[PDB]
Amino acid sequence: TGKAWCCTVLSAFGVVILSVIAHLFNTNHESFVGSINDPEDGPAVAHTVYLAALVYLVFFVFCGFQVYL
């Protein structure tokens, strides 16, 4: 029900947006690390965000079985 669809579509695109973000920090894209106030180390931030996306991936597969049944 709606209690499960919510974290399914939410965590669907958390897997997508956070992974596209982490790809860019890793490759040191200018818009994400170009200014001084941006973080100094690109890949260190990506390591922290690859893991955050996996946490949403677990909520996705779990709630997928919940609604599927």
Binding site: L10, G14, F25, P39, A44, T48, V49, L51, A52, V55
Partner: protein
């Protein structure tokens, strides 16, 4: 007396048509304003919520990225789509009813309501 009714309808038509060319052209500036506002709220929403999490590391940094993204995504889906979409949608409607349709739309027509049976909900 009928010559008067053809005049007073013709004297009001001009004083409107001339003024309204100045007030309609100015109305279209809401295209600029609602664009600028939508853009700034989006950046402020990014700069307060997700830009913060990237400055953390460890298990505690991982948790904030999970918590802060959800609040970004939710305020985004509600404040910047529903609240802003319904505003802009109704301003687009205004420019048709009041600006475009004034130029050519006469109105006062009779509708078409034929006689037909239908299921009556009771």
């Amino acid at each position: 007396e009928d010559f008067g009714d053809i005049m007073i309808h013709q004297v009001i038509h001009t004083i409107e048509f001339c003024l309204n060319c100045v007030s309609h052209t100015a109305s279209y500036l809401r295209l600029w304003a609602l664009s600028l506002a939508h853009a700034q709220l989006s950046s402020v929403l990014w700069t307060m919520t997700i830009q913060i999490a990237f400055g953390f590391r460890g298990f505690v940094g991982v948790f904030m990225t999970v918590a802060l993204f959800a609040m970004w995504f939710a305020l985004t889906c509600a404040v910047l789509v529903l609240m802003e979409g319904t505003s802009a949608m109704l301003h687009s409607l205004r420019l048709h009813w009041v600006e475009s349709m004034s130029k050519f739309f006469v109105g006062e027509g009779l509708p078409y309501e034929p006689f037909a049976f239908e299921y009556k909900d009771m």
